[PDB]
């Protein structure tokens, strides 16, 4: 039972590295895109104002 409860003490509490790391990298890439998307949106109001001096 000690072996069985330790086996059940995994995928319940113990994390895996296979599916969770690609979620970490996906989130990190998403954060990279999310930080970059505002870098292409900050100049949009400036260009909008640029029609008139």
């Amino acid at each position: 039972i000690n072996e069985n409860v330790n086996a059940s003490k995994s995928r319940i509490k113990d994390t895996d590295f296979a599916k969770e790391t690609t979620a970490l990298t996906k989130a990190q890439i998403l954060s990279q895109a999310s930080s970059s998307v505002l870098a292409q949106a900050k100049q949009a109001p400036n260009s909008a104002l640029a029609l008139l001096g």
Binding site: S31, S34, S35, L38
Partner: protein, 54 residues
């Protein structure tokens, strides 16, 4: 993306698990060399009393 540099809670949490993880590991490398799983009363106080009596 949440910009912040005056604090890094991710590093603080990682350090908190860092300290706890190899604190127990530091308790190792000594039980192996000594050959005893009891070396200090802070580990198992009840075990120390009975082990000394035995």
């Amino acid at each position: 993306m949440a910009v912040n540099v005056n604090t890094n809670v991710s590093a603080m949490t990682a350090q908190r698990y860092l300290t706890s993880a190899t604190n127990a590991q530091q308790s190792s490398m000594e039980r192996l060399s000594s050959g005893y799983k009891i070396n200090s009363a802070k580990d198992d106080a009840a075990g120390l009393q009975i082990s000394n009596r035995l």
